[PDB]
Amino acid sequence: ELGTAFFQQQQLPAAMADTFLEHLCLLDIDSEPVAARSTSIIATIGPASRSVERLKEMIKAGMNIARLNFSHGSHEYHAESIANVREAVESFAGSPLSYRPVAIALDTKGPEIYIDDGLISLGVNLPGAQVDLPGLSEQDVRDLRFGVEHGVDIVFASFVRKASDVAAVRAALGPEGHGIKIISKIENHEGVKRFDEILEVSDGIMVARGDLGIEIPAEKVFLAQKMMIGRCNLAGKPVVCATQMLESMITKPRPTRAETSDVANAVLDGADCIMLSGETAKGNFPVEAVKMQHAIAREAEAAVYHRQLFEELRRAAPLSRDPTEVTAIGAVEAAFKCCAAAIIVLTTTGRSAQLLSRYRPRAAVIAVTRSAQAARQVHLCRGVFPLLYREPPEAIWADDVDRRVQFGIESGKLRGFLRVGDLVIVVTGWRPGSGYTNIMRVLSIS
Amino acid sequence: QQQLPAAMADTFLEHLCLLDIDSEPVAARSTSIIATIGPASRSVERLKEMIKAGMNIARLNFSHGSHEYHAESIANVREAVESFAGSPLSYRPVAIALDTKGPEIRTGEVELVKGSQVLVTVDPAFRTRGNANTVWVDYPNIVRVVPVGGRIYIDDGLISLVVQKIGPEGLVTQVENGGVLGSRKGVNLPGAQVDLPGLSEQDVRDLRFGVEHGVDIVFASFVRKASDVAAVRAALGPEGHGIKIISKIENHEGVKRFDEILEVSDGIMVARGDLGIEIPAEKVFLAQKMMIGRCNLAGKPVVCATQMLESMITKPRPTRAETSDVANAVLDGADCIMLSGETAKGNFPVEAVKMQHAIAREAEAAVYHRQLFEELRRAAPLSRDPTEVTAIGAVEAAFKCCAAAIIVLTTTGRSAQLLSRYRPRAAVIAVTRSAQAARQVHLCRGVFPLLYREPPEAIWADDVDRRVQFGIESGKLRGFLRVGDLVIVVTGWRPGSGYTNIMRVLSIS
Amino acid sequence: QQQQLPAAMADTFLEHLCLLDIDSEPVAARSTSIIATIGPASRSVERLKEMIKAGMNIARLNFSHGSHEYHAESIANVREAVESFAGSPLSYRPVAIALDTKGPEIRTVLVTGNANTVWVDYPIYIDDGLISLVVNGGVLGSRKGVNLPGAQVDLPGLSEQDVRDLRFGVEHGVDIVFASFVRKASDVAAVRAALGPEGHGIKIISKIENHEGVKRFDEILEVSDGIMVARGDLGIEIPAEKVFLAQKMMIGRCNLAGKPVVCATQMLESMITKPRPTRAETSDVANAVLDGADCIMLSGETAKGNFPVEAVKMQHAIAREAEAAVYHRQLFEELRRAAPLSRDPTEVTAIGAVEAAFKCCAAAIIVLTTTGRSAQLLSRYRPRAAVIAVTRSAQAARQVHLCRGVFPLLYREPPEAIWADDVDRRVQFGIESGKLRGFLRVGDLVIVVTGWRPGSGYTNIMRVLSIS
Amino acid sequence: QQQQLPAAMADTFLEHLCLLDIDSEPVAARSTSIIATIGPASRSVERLKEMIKAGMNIARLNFSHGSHEYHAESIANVREAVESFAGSPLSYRPVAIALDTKGPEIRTGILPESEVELVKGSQVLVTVDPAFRTRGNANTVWVDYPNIVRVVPVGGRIYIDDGLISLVVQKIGPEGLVTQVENGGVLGSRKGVNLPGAQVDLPGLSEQDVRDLRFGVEHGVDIVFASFVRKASDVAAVRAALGPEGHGIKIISKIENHEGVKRFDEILEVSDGIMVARGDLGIEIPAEKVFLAQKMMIGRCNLAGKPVVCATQMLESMITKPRPTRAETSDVANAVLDGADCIMLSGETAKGNFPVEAVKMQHAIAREAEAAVYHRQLFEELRRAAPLSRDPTEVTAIGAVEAAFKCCAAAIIVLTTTGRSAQLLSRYRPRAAVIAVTRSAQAARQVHLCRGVFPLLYREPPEAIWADDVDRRVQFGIESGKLRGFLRVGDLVIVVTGWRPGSGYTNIMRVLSIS
């Protein structure tokens, strides 16, 4: 079973290797990946990526999260950016089976001798020399309030140095902002040393390599990146790799060999999301940069050694009596046995999708939700493909479950994620409401 | 408890160092016990005590006894077994297996002069002239299968003779080990390609008897080739299509052609008695472990047999070697262990069943589960069969929650067998309407069969849930489940076998 | 290929099992040493010669029966049988002599002498745990051993009779003491003290016979030279279905510690009366070798039975097959990982030589040693290649039988004038010995382990040589 | 710890990652050799002295440009810079000289600065009619490779000028290939052509390569980077042009196109090593697939025990800037973690403004990456994958590496004539430095290809007794290691020698304490 032609795509020969060395030796440039790209793409909004028509092209190219850099720009500037992103996003809502949710992330200005990205020794950086600035500014507080008022999904918190820095952020978001995800940016030596306590109170991490590369020796950034990716992977919390991934594409139509390798290796490290800064904020090829990250991620996701990664994630995760976790790991294992084209999961808060994503299945996790915010926020979790369901409930709940599953199948077919004859794993619960996921089924498509 | 520190170890060496004589087993015994029926074990009262002690499969040795004798054994077994049918929540199915006589080469008191000279003839005139320097055998082709230098063992391999010459009179032999030969006693032709028929005529009448009396399993003696298995299945006829054929590997050719035999069998018996004569005794453990390992790989049941607790025929306690042999068979991966003389004729048949049960529980907890499961996972090929996909998903889920059990609904047993091959720590509670399948699934380690008796409900989904609740209630009464426990439930999307495709995580109430 | 080498190269333990082959023939060199108990069936010089040829490496003197004069006769007959082969040095097999202590023993319903009231020698299991009395039973006899598993006992860690027996062993130059019913580290120190300064070179093997010994195993092992899993008494002290747990635990911890371990009792019991063992008994011997046992033991099979030599031959035949079936790939990896890093050039050289031998499927590792330590550090990493140890010390040649896979050759010639020449002559003596014994053939690779200067403690050199 | 040893001891790769420590400084010497391309920014004797001190191990001469006299000047200044350290033999660093051939090329025709625009969606004809050699324009391009009309089927593509312009063959006709412009651009004269996925008929050697290869032999270059190697016969043609006098020269095959990737195994078997020529590879196959080819090729050379080089744009931004980008520093680190024996600088040292700082950056990155290797799984997999062998040099090598790990040996000192004994130690990736003592100056330079080998040139004449000569070179290796910081008093070393003179008889491993 499993056709001979199907077994030579998606780097499946390298997938069945008994050793990592053989896994490397069997990687094949003719082995084509699936269309579903698991690693989400964060694009920074700026002069080059602010118009509604430009944003439409970046959505089709693969942008999942739009980053607002509050280091620059008035609230009126950012309100117009949010208005333009939402206009381009909703411009596709007339076609539910192809609609792509897009999250909006607010990046704080933060606490802002080296000058000019650390280019001249004596933006300004003071490495080692511990300085005084508090966790949250008084302009940060006004910016975060702007985030709640305009309904942003994610906060990128700059220069997080300790757990209390995160709590100050969460306090500024307020009770109405309790649902916003907080990604703590690790930007200096202190944040690295206090990483374990920062991660426990955050929803995720951004390896902010720009400032980190000035605050610590440039030779050491990859050590910090691979440490933080593994620790969030172990913790099952999303991790973002950022800064200068395709830097030369600011002026050039094609990246360097080091840049494509950097995106690929960030994906192989286990990063949930990869980021573009000047490549989309200022550069001359914002859409091409998005297209390049999409293409590399597809290749690198197939080149992950899932065999060992799944085993180690399984051994490191503690035993659980939560039926959502138990169902998730079983569905992921079941998906590996059949190379299921997808895991289709129903979720309202996104947790069931995240618990599937944390075991890193090869199969795409197609998440059908009625919550527009959850559809935006699950882009943080690798391999989750969110579908916004818009119909009012069927009268029998079981019929309403089945129709959402069918909606996931129909959207997967249209997008090239699913074909007739594919096996799919379907994850649901035994009753409506969040928290009751406990069922895994094996279905053939059509 | 249950050797959890040893099972979590990073290495096998540390797993060994963490084994704990004070850590008590709490899981139910998963290795099935086969007990040979004989004079010590034909009492209905004794059979009831053997059921409660742990007997899962009753073996009828057709090497001896008439059809009427075995019909009585069958009737006493079923009476003892059905005596528990009034409480369906605790009723234990018990399989009945027919072990065939098989091709038995036989001779014609006279002493075998060690180092002497004895000839073994084929001529029919010498069938009654047996003595110190004449032996006759009913196998005519013995003269064409054992060359010069090959050996001929007699009476359980304690008297040996080597071929020195070949000639018209017969085979010219010399006595290697001495003894005195009786009247028509067992002969073995080690290493030689014995081309006796794959089925005696006695075997064909016995297999017809077994079909007529509804036996669940055939232990097929001296299986050397795939065609030997097909000969057995032919004699069962398609009236015996549902009977499971377990092939007894008993000689050198069977070990060599094992893979061809396993492919056409439902399982294997490591018949160490005959095998220990047909090949050197010091090589039997190699063949045992090879066969157990490859049946584990193929997901097919394997039985370890013969002399596991031999001294308990006359003594109330086993030796240290016998204790270790039973334990190491479980550690090897054997689905079933067997008692022969210990239950057929010995003085402590119940105590022998109790011992095997007690040893099996300790060994099952001493298994290095971490490496076993990982290796069975990677070795089992990718599959698009939904029952296969659900089974491995279910075993994975059971490990994550430390599930008390995996409840599975099954018509033929296959869905339980596909769970069993991944060796979950959780018990596989199999709920079936098929009384025969309830008995036959004892061959698969870790499956606990429950026979469902109620007639079908009007709504199919109501009938599914009733069966699931039947497994819940049986599990609670037998000690497998507690309130607050998590269980994995495996079902299908439509009636009939072959459509298993659902795995659920449920809390017990 | 032979030696189960296809199974040796499997990537998983499951495939290792799957590839085992009854037609794959093993190497003549048998690594697991055989201990045979001396008794009426194994006492004549002519019978001991047959058991030496059959494969007996250590002679066990059971000091629970027989007088001091009786055991001197046994010692004298063993040394006469052993030295009867000394005239051919290339084939001389050293044999060690082990003293097994009586230990704390309680010998012989109303227990306070017939079949209604039983007298005992100490203020309940009798007949090797076959009869149960409680303040379940069978048929008794006269003079019986009594086990009391549970309530704690007032017998000392070393009796006066035991002390007298230990001093007998020093005076008669035994190589090994099997210390009965060791429960604590203090019990071993008591044996080391009764052996005195004149007996400081004797190896103390602690016998684990009860629940307390299992519990305090780590502290007992740390002060012992090795361990005997005494399954006879241990099988009466703890439930019979749990002895296999204690055996495998103890064999694993000794293998990790690098100290020898003995598996004993009823391994081939039915051969006391029958010429062939049962299927369970050959499995128990094979599984003891697969567990990692350095030595296997025969007691009644050689002491009192009617087939003592055939019993030695059976253990020899099984051990060879089981040794080849060991999954060295995973065992060596796990031994390397668990052993701490070392700055000792002897241990550093040892693990390199074992690795090198696996790479070339070397027929043997030839090591020069005086105390035996260089050979033990090789044995510790469980190579498939035979460890041929050439030594001038007769005692080391006997005692090194405790370590699995060490084949001792006693070298007798005075030193050559150039020490480099004296080294080569001893290496050559091992090569010639291995050729005659069938360990080596022309074209084989061997690993030669020596040191850079004379005297113990300087092993630091590993050489790859092809046999001419 | 230091050395990232808590991470290397971890039981899983996941926990190994979590335990990487930015505050754990490396103490072992840098094992991945650095190749620096010689050019205007690196041709002066004093600048080359700076780069040798910064860590340059191999000097790359790019015969794609420059005259024979130009490259002979490059060789003279390199050798003058290298030999200015020879007066202190205990610290003299051999520096290899590698010749990178221009290789077979396909180029367009001459239309001065005359330029034309190939418009997107246009119709352009590619012809090799010698009458069209000069008649280039916006709908017609000539190329100097006549078999182009046979190797590019309809729907196949033709790239021009570093892949800036893309053409798709629509029909095969008598005049040539009629193509539609897929990606437009401005076309100059004599621009390079690439035929992605095509089986290119060009010989393994251009006629200029033959001349350059003889120049290399006559000037004693140590290494050849053979361009555009697509099959075993290409390597054979390179070998033949070097002749018997160039038989000691090492041949590193540059894998540059799709065929070379697919036929990698037959190429590697007849090669001394491989270069992942990512620059050309990224034009010949999709850019997002290059990392697949890099990791496959590094793994298969790791498995075969043959050196592998990763090249192109590793620190590209440092051509104009004193600090690399975050992507570039990660690219160097990940090439080392892949298992690359060498890393390369091209424009960063040939023409950039910071050549010495680029060499310093690669040295500092590689030192961090080498300690961040999950050594436990790497050595275990290399060990089990390496087959059984009855060759005593192979047996001694794995024995020495195992012993080095057991004692955390500071170094493995090995005596070698050709370098093979050092290479056999290097293939098992020990963390101990492999200190190779040789009398051959060429072998000393060439073993820089093998990761973890640190060559020392022995200059003394042979002692009377051979056993004295061996011990002298061993002590020379010890005294060199002490002076260079490899070895301290009280350290343990693994010394690897043989039983008789001449190469091929390595069979002894010794454990020694230093001083």
Ligand SMILES: Cc1nc2c(s1)c1cnn(Cc3ccc(O)cc3)c(=O)c1n2C
């Ligand atoms: C999901 C996983 N990712 C990795 C794994 S598992 C792994 C395991 N081992 N090693 C070291 C090694 C081993 C063999 C080689 O040929 C090269 C490197 C790795 O680097 C390595 N990675 C990056």
Ligand SMILES: O=P(O)(O)OC[C@H]1O[C@](O)(COP(=O)(O)O)[C@@H](O)[C@@H]1O
């Ligand atoms: O991931 P979440 O937020 O816990 O939601 C999972 C829930 O979705 C469902 O599948 C469907 O629930 P709804 O019909 O209320 O959307 C439930 O069975 C399950 O509890």
Ligand SMILES: O=P(O)(O)OC[C@H]1O[C@](O)(COP(=O)(O)O)[C@@H](O)[C@@H]1O
């Ligand atoms: O294990 P088997 O023999 O394939 O049978 C499993 C079958 O049992 C069921 O759960 C119920 O079967 P029935 O209702 O026909 O008894 C099916 O859904 C499933 O196909």
Ligand SMILES: O=P(O)(O)OC[C@H]1O[C@](O)(COP(=O)(O)O)[C@@H](O)[C@@H]1O
């Ligand atoms: O194992 P031991 O007792 O430490 O002896 C090993 C010793 O044997 C030798 O190989 C030879 O020593 P001798 O010549 O004194 O017997 C030494 O080089 C080495 O130190």
Ligand SMILES: O=P(O)(O)OC[C@H]1O[C@](O)(COP(=O)(O)O)[C@@H](O)[C@@H]1O
């Ligand atoms: O690595 P290579 O080229 O095979 O050479 C290793 C050789 O080096 C030697 O030490 C030779 O020493 P010489 O330089 O004196 O010839 C031999 O022992 C060994 O055969």
Ligand SMILES: [K+]
């Ligand atoms: K039978």
Ligand SMILES: [K+]
């Ligand atoms: K070039």
Ligand SMILES: [Mn+2]
């Ligand atoms: Mn920053």
Ligand SMILES: [Mn+2]
């Ligand atoms: Mn039989």
Ligand SMILES: [Mn+2]
């Ligand atoms: Mn005892």
Ligand SMILES: [Mn+2]
């Ligand atoms: Mn090129």
